[PDB]
Design a protein around this ligand. Structure first.
Ligand SMILES: *[C@@H]1O[C@H](CO)[C@@H](O[C@@H]2O[C@H](CO)[C@@H](O[C@@H]3O[C@H](CO)[C@@H](O)[C@H](O)[C@@H]3O)[C@H](O)[C@H]2NC(C)=O)[C@H](O)[C@H]1NC(C)=O
Lengths: 213, 148, 921, 221
């Protein structure tokens, strides 16, 4: 029937920047659109309704433009309360729909990633599971390149990564990689090397661990 | 055949049992007609709509005159009666007639008097209409003739 | 052995080919508009607004000129609304009934849509909620938002309940995202109990030309004993300037000609009566040459009233059969009686409007040669019995044949000049002789009077006729010396002197035929008391009790006004209340005597006074009231009615009656009779069941109709032997609660004076009762003792709202029409209000039966403090009644027993008792 | 006033129907619709359905049609939710909200619930194993060295981890977990110190798993 899409997925915003987020629908809803934001792990609060009007307890820093099948949202200056995920909705036709979400890029900067290497332990190899852990700390933007070297073997699909959200101190991300292998395939090799390639890092940094010394 | 039972304006009837009957009629001003012993039955109208199909050959020939051309310029009378399953309300409706027409086309002479003049070429201007009394062009036309 | 499949298939097979078909149409198209004709000089414009209908209006046009005729291209205009809201409101609802109103919201929109509907609470209706929010700036009823699909229709209901009588305004708000739309609707709230009308007339002749001078009359304010609480009395006053002025006003003052009675229109008789007022008005206008009354063009009104006349005459043609015989009901067996009556109608109308002579001749021939006996008496064809006559079976059949013969003689005599004929004259001599020599053995004054008039329209020189005249003159009844009033009754064994002073349809009929006989014999000194009686016996609508009496009575009045020359009308009239102030004063002349009927607004004894003047002024006051009981009335019929349940399955209703003849009457049963069943609020009936009880050879009733939520049937006769029952299914239209009982009435058509009325209902149990169910009705404190202390009872007792505080004992408990009447005897007085409460008198209390909070125990002593002391006047005495509110105090009183808690309770109670008996406050 | 109570975290098998309810308090219960919505983790949210208390009127999304059941109780002013034949990928965070229909073109989602985290049962319940991650001698260049502990093969979530029982509140980072192929998670918790402070000091990594009732201590050297 009627449904809408939200754009963009993300945008870079400085603390004092000016940003815009839009969405658009199947059929013209006239003035039927609503905007709201959600802080992580919490219930979202209503911000704009009717695509124009401001809710009570909602500051004037939030502006929006509401006519037709296409709808826009305008923030002139970001605030510490403005870092969250955002969503747009239509209230008109019987099947209420929603948008695909918006991520906020908190800081304008280019950071330098940290590369650490963590081999398994003595208590870890007693159950038959060896996990090779590669660590990246405090970089930006969120996208990073983590490449595995076990004696000329790049193992992808038997390793599982994880991404941590921004550390509010410096407003930059962190990432980990847990390579889960057995203890039978862990002893076939010797030299372990993890390679990290980043946007703010020209030379990919490789950290190694030696077996048999 | 599609039948629609509704209440007021757009309000549809929910549950209905519908019974339909047919007959062969000579003309539209005759208050009697030849009814047909075998008629469709017990079709439940759901959401204000019911549909049936009627075989003229099957429902006529064994009961009555058995050739498709024998019904020409003779109409088909339809009688529908609808009962409401929930409330027991019963109502009737009918179509007085539907004309059986052999050929979809009907012909008539135009601008061609019926008197021929000796030695002059005789024009014959023929006109082709449909069952709606509307002109239909591009129709092939064959003229056979005999002179005495 | 068949299930329900073939059961309906059978009736579906037999619906067709047994009958040919029936004429009728399932759709209705109202009066067309834009019928005007105009002269257009190449340009014109006419602006107006469309009606509200969802319709494709095809507007087409035609025009002509010296060139010729031209068909304008048909213009297509379709009135349509994509979002439209329909609202179903019932005809009438009685206060106290919890009633949901259902309504349908429709949408033609391409796709689905969601909406809201707001109820506007008007100040006299509890919404079970009272949703109106005045807390914030803009007040609203809130809403329940509901959805509907595209091109769909959804139902929405609202549950409510009335308080005030006749609160006519409720608004409905339809709100979509596009905006709002307003629908205003009206609610009829009607009083409970039953309607009853009391008629008080008076005639004004300050000169006393006609045998008495009357300059004044007093109609008091009389409150009925059983009158419904919180219901005021209705009074209507009509002042007209001639004996027939009220009839003329009935025709002219109200543009549409109103039915003079509330009798049903089913019979061919009732269709014949519809032309009577127009006819007699026309007679007085043309014969006396009184047309000068119109300030507008007189001749235009002559053509208009003439046209109304002809239309009213052709009104009854539908009941004429193929032989020009007139049947009492459509398609039924024709009756000599009604055919003769219609022959009288057309016979009188043929003077000013020429009817078909051939049809008249054929009709006369049909009744004359078709049904007549060898002695000249006439035999009735159909099973229709016009009236019930006194005497046993031989006397009743003889008297009945006499009445029929006199009736048909009247008819044929009235119409004879249109088709004078040898044969019909011969039969006229036959029946005239039969009347002459078989009437003198008189039995009832009814038959003697009708025969006297029938023979009065014939040869007037017969000595036997003058003997019947002398006997009927012997049977006269007179009020006052010298004669003031004169009239007649049924005098057989009734020759004792009794005048209940109650107008009887039969009585008015008898005295009417007597009067007409006098007018044709032209004895004037004998007449004036009679017209004095009938002119004051008339109603506001110009009609009398029944049809048969009203026709002959009106003809008598009119011919009287046309014989004795009317006097110039000059009067200064004023009406005023006795103790209260003065009301509108009528200064009445020959120009405006037709002035508005005025309803008496105030409740007071009414008095009408007139100055010195000439003429004859009719003043009639009719009084509409409601009351809660039939126990006072005179019931002529065994009545029983109840509701069953069947095995889809529905609810069933069955009513039953039997005739209770008087000692003079025989066991042969009743005459033409009518059964009215009032349907309770929000429940209809099955048309098909009645239509089956009517339309076939086994018909148990001659005609049925449903009028304003009333199921009315007509029947030839009601047997005195056993009960007869009508039975039909019923439908619940919407959920109702605490519904009030309705009326079931049965009466004779030609004499409604014999009737019986009854209350009935579907069924009753307790509802739960939570939201606004009890409206300010009652509260009762708990048994034994509470934290309640005697000095708090001093606060509430001496409260200025509370007039009286005393304890009494229960005497009797009576249930009358949803209202509870408690008889109680007083025990100990503390402080009394404006009403005097004597020791141990039997007083009364009222209760609304829908309140399960406060209830009373048989014979147990209670402490009561009432706020209000109510009074009622009988004009010889004033009786007190005590209302029971939710602000009134009720506490249980134990007797002397020692329960663990009893001592302290009697201590608190006696403490308060002597505290207030000290006149402490 | 406006109060909406949300149910507790439920864990049920892949295809066993799960129940979550919402309580309404402070307003007129049957006069306003109640909406149910689902957020799949880390991505957009999907509108699920609505219900009219006291009219019982329901409508659902056709994707989840015949997976969903809404019921109403006016006694406790509560609305119940049941999901049958769901699976592991359905499990997500679910919320209730109140639809406020304004008397003008103002239509809100007004008051919201606290949310219910619903999770699928994988290998029922299992306790965490905590394996050290030690630094090296030659891999730390001059200013920086990292040391930590790994919590692996546990179920269900969450796992609350501390350092010296809350003595390090700054400079300590911990990574959210990731699902293995056995129905278990791997999460890492580390701290960064200079090479000299790493050499001599005692850092004890405390691992507290409440749902599985387990604590594991780690000596990092
Ligand atoms: C239901 O709808 C009716 C529609 O008639 C509305 O009634 C409105 O009531 C107001 C009362 O203030 C009326 O205004 C008054 O007008 C008189 C002059 O006629 C003025 O003297 C007063 O001071 C006052 O201004 C108004 O005319 C009337 N009709 C409208 C607005 O169309 C109202 O919306 C609803 N009423 C009820 C009783 O539910």
């Amino acid at each position: 029937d009627i449904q809408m899409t939200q754009s963009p997925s993300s945008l870079s915003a400085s603390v004092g920047d000016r940003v815009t987020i839009t969405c658009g629908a199947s059929e013209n809803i006239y003035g039927a659109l609503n905007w709201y934001q959600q802080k992580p792990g919490k219930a979202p609060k209503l911000l704009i309704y009717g695509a124009t009007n401001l809710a009570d307890g909602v500051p004037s820093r939030f502006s929006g433009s509401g006519s037709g099948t296409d709808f826009t949202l305008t923030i002139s200056s970001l605030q510490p309360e403005d870092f969250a995920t955002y969503y747009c909705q239509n209230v008109l036709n019987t099947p209420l729909t929603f948008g695909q979400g918006t991520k906020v890029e908190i800081k304008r900067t280019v950071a330098a990633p940290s590369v650490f290497i963590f081999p398994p332990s003595d208590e870890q190899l007693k159950s038959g599971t060896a996990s090779v852990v590669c660590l990246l700390n405090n970089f930006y933007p969120r996208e990073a390149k983590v490449q595995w070297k076990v004696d000329n073997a790049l193992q992808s699909g038997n390793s599982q990564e994880s991404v941590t959200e921004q550390d509010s101190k410096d407003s930059t991300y962190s990432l980990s990689s847990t390579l889960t292998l057995s203890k039978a395939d862990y002893e076939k090799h010797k030299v372990y090397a993890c390679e990290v390639t980043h946007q703010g890092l020209s030379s990919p940094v490789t950290k190694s661990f030696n077996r048999g010394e | 055949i599609t039948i629609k039972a509704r209440y007021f304006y757009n309000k549809v009837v929910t549950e209905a049992d519908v019974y339909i009957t047919f007959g062969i009629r000579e003309d539209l001003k005759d208050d009697q007609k030849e009814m047909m012993q075998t008629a469709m039955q017990n079709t439940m109208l759901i959401n204000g709509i019911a549909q049936v199909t009627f075989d003229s050959e099957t429902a006529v020939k064994e009961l009555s005159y058995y050739s498709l051309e024998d019904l020409n310029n003779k109409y088909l009378y339809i009688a529908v009666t609808v009962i409401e399953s929930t409330g027991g309300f019963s109502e009737e409706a009918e179509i007085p007639g539907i004309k059986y027409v052999l050929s979809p086309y009907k012909l008539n002479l135009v601008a061609t008097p019926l008197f021929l003049k000796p030695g002059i070429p005789y024009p014959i201007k023929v006109q082709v209409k449909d069952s709606l009394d509307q002109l239909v062009g591009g129709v092939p036309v064959t003229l056979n003739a005999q002179t005495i | 052995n068949i299930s329900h499949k073939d059961m309906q298939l059978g009736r579906l097979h037999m619906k067709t080919l047994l009958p040919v078909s029936k004429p009728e149409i399932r759709s209705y198209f109202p009066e067309s508009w834009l019928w005007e004709v105009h002269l257009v000089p190449r340009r014109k414009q006419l602006q107006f607004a469309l009606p509200d209908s969802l319709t494709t209006w095809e507007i087409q046009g035609v025009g002509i000129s010296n060139t010729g005729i031209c068909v304008a291209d048909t213009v297509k205009a379709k009135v349509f609304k994509d979002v439209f809201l329909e609202m179903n409101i019932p005809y009438s609802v009685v206060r106290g009934e919890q009633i949901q109103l259902k309504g349908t919201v429709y949408n033609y929109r391409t796709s689905g849509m969601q909406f809201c509907v707001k109820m506007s609470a008007v100040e006299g209706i509890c919404t079970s909620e009272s949703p109106v929010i005045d807390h914030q700036g803009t007040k609203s009823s809130k809403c329940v938002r509901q959805k509907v699909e595209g091109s769909s229709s959804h139902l929405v209901t609202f549950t409510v309940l009335p308080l005030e009588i006749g609160l006519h305004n409720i608004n409905f708000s339809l709100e979509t995202w596009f905006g709002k739309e307003i629908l205003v609707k009206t609610l009829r709230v009607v009083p409970e109990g039953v309607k009853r009308e009391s008629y008080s007339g008076v005639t004004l002749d300050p000169r006393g030309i006609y045998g008495t001078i009357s300059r004044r009359k007093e109609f008091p304010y009389r409150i009925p004993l059983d009158l419904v609480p919180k219901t005021e009395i209705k009074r209507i006053l009509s002042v007209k300037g001639l004996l027939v002025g009220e009839i003329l006003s009935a025709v002219l003052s109200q543009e549409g000609i109103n039915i003079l009675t509330h009798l049903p229109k089913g019979s061919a008789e009732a269709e014949l009566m519809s032309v009577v007022p127009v006819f007699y008005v026309f007679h007085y206008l043309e014969t006396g040459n009184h047309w000068n009354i119109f300030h507008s063009d007189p001749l235009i009104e002559k053509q208009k009233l003439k046209k109304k006349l002809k239309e009213g005459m052709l009104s009854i043609m539908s009941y004429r059969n193929a032989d020009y015989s007139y049947s009492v009901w459509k398609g039924g067996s024709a009756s000599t009686w009604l055919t003769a009556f219609a022959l009288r109608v057309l016979g009188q109308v043929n003077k000013y409007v020429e009817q078909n002579q051939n049809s008249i001749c054929n009709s006369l021939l049909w009744l004359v040669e078709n049904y007549q006996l060898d002695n000249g008496s006439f035999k009735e064809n159909s099973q229709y019995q016009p009236i019930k006559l006194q005497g046993t079976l031989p006397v009743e059949a003889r008297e009945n044949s006499l009445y029929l013969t006199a009736f048909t003689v009247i008819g044929i005599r009235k119409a004879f000049d249109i088709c004078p004929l040898v044969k019909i004259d011969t039969a006229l001599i036959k029946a005239d002789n039969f009347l002459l020599e078989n009437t003198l053995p008189a039995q009832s004054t009814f038959t003697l009077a009708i025969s006297a008039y029938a023979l009065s329209l014939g040869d007037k020189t017969h000595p036997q006729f003058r003997s019947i005249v002398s006997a009927l003159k012997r049977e006269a009844l007179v009020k006052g010396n010298p004669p003031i009033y004169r009239f007649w009754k049924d005098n057989l064994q009734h020759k004792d002197s009794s005048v209940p002073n109650t107008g009887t349809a039969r009585m008015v009929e008898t005295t009417a035929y007597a009067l007409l006989t006098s007018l044709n014999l032209k004895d004037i000194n004998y007449v004036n008391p009679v017209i004095k009686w009938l002119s004051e016996e008339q109603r506001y609508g110009g009609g009398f009790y029944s049809t048969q009496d009203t026709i002959n009575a009106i003809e008598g009045l009119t011919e009287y006004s046309l014989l004795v020359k009317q006097l110039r009308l000059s009067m200064d009239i004023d009406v005023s209340y006795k103790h209260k102030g003065a009301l509108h004063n009528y200064k009445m002349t020959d120009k405006n005597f037709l002035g508005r009927p005025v309803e008496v607004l105030l409740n007071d004894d009414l008095i009408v006074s007139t100055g010195f003047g000439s003429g004859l002024a009719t003043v009639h006051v009719t009084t509409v009231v409601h009351k809660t009981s039939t126990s006072e009335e005179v019931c002529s019929f065994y009545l029983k009615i109840d509701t069953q349940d069947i095995e889809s399955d529905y609810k069933r209703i069955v009513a039953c009656a039997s005739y209770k003849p008087s000692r003079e009457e025989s066991s042969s049963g009743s005459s033409h009779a009518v059964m009215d069943i009032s349907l309770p609020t929000g429940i209809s009936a099955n048309e098909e069941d009645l239509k089956a009880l009517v339309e076939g050879v086994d018909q148990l009733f001659t005609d049925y109709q449903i009028k304003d939520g009333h199921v009315i049937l007509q029947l030839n006769s009601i047997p005195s032997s056993d009960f007869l029952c009508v039975r039909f299914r019923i439908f619940e239209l919407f959920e109702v609660g605490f519904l009030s009982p309705a009326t079931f009435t049965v009466y004779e058509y030609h004499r409604p004076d014999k009737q019986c009325t009854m209350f009935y209902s579907t069924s009753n149990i307790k509802i739960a009762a939570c939201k606004c169910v009890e409206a300010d009705c009652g509260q009762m404190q708990e048994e034994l003792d509470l934290t309640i202390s005697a000095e708090t009872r001093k606060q509430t007792a001496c409260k200025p709202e509370i007039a009286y505080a005393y304890k009494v004992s229960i005497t009797s408990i009576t249930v009358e029409n949803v209202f509870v009447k408690y008889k109680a005897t007083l025990l100990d007085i503390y402080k009394t209000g404006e009403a005097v409460a004597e020791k141990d008198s039997e007083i009364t209390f009222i209760k609304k039966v829908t309140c399960t909070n406060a209830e009373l125990v048989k014979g147990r002593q209670y402490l009561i403090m009432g706020k209000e002391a109510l009074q009622i006047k009988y004009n010889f005495s004033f009786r007190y009644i005590y209302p029971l509110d939710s602000l009134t105090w009720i506490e249980y009183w134990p007797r002397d027993t020692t329960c663990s808690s009893c001592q302290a309770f009697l201590a608190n109670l006696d403490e308060f008792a002597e505290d207030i008996f000290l006149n402490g406050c | 006033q406006v109060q909406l109570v949300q149910s507790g975290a439920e864990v049920k098998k892949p295809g066993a129907s799960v129940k979550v309810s919402c309580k309404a308090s402070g307003y007129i219960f049957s006069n306003y619709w109640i909406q149910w919505v689902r957020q799949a983790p880390g991505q957009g949210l999907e509108w699920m359905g609505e219900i009219l208390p006291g009219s019982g009127s329901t409508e659902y999304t056709e994707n989840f049609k015949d997976r969903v059941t809404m019921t109403r109780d006016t006694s406790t002013s509560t609305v119940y939710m049941e999901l049958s034949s769901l699976r592991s990928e359905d499990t997500a965070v679910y919320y209730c909200a109140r639809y406020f229909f304004g008397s003008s073109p103002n239509w809100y989602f007004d008051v919201w619930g606290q949310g219910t985290l619903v999770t699928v049962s994988s290998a029922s319940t299992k306790g965490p194993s905590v394996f050290p991650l030690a630094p090296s001698s030659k891999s730390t260049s001059g200013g920086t060295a990292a040391l930590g502990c790994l919590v692996k093969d546990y179920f269900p979530e969450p796992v609350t981890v501390s350092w010296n029982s809350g003595a390090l509140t700054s400079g300590v980072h911990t990574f959210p977990a990731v699902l293995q192929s056995s129905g278990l998670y791997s999460l890492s918790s580390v701290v960064t110190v200079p090479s000299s402070s790493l050499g001599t000091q005692t850092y004890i990594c405390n691992v507290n798993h409440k749902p599985s009732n387990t604590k594991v201590d780690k000596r990092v050297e």
